[PDB]
DNA sequence: CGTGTCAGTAGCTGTCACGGATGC
DNA sequence: GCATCCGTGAGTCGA
C-alpha cells in the first residue's frame, strides 16, 4: 500500500528501497528502541505509546 | 559454591535492565533534577539488594515495590534541609 | 521507621558562519 | 579517503 500511495514519486521508492528493517511488530520496536531507550521492547508497549 | 555468589550479581543485573528506567522517569517527574532521580534509582535498587523479599517472588510484581520506595524517598528529600535552602 | 495490584520529564529548533576533529 | 557534526564566536555604558 506504501508503494500504492507514494508510487508517483522515486523519491519514495529510494525511500523504501534503502529502509532497514521491514515488518510492521519490527519498525514499531524500532521506533520504542529509539523514543524510550533502556527499556524492554514489547509490541504492546509500544502499540501503546 | 562461587557460581551461587555469581547467580546474585546477575539477578540484580537483571532487575536493572527490567526496572531501572522506567523507575528513573518516574522519579524524574517526582524531583525534576536528572541528577537527583539517578541517585533515587541508586539508592532504590540498593534497598532491594538487601531485601531477599522482594527478589525472591517473580510472579508478584516488584515495580511497585521499587515505585513506593522511591516515592518515600522522594518526599523525604522535600522536608527541612531543602525547606531552608534550596 | 516500613515501604509492596495501574502507577513513567517538560520542553522544544524560529541563530549562523566557520573551521577541523570525528566518524561510516 | 571525505561527508558529518561538534563547538566556537557574535558592541559598550546606564538609572
Redesign the pocket.
Known amino acids: 500500500q506504501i508503494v500504492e500511495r507514494f508510487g508517483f514519486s522515486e523519491i519514495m521508492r529510494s525511500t523504501l528501497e534503502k529502509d532497514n528493517t521491514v515488518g510492521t511488530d519490527e519498525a514499531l520496536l524500532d521506533i520504542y528502541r529509539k523514543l524510550?531507550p533502556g527499556?524492554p521492547p514489547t509490541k504492546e508497549?509500544a502499540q501503546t505509546? | 559454591v562461587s557460581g551461587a555468589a555469581a547467580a546474585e550479581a546477575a539477578l540484580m543485573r537483571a532487575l536493572y535492565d527490567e526496572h531501572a528506567?522506567?523507575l528513573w522517569?518516574?522519579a524524574?517527574?517526582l524531583t525534576?533534577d536528572?541528577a537527583q532521580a539517578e541517585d533515587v534509582v541508586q539508592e532504590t535498587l540498593l534497598?532491594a539488594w538487601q531485601?531477599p523479599?522482594?527478589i525472591g517472588?517473580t510472579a508478584?510484581?516488584?515495580?511497585?515495590?521499587l515505585?513506593?520506595?522511591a516515592?518515600?524517598?522522594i518526599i523525604?528529600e522535600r522536608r527541612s534541609a531543602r525547606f531552608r535552602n534550596v
Do not use: C, I, K, Q
Request: no cysteine; net charge positive.
Open positions: 524510550r527499556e508497549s505509546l | 528506567a522506567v522517569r518516574y524524574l517527574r525534576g536528572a534497598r531485601h523479599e522482594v517472588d508478584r510484581p516488584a515495580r511497585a515495590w515505585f513506593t520506595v516515592r518515600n524517598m523525604d
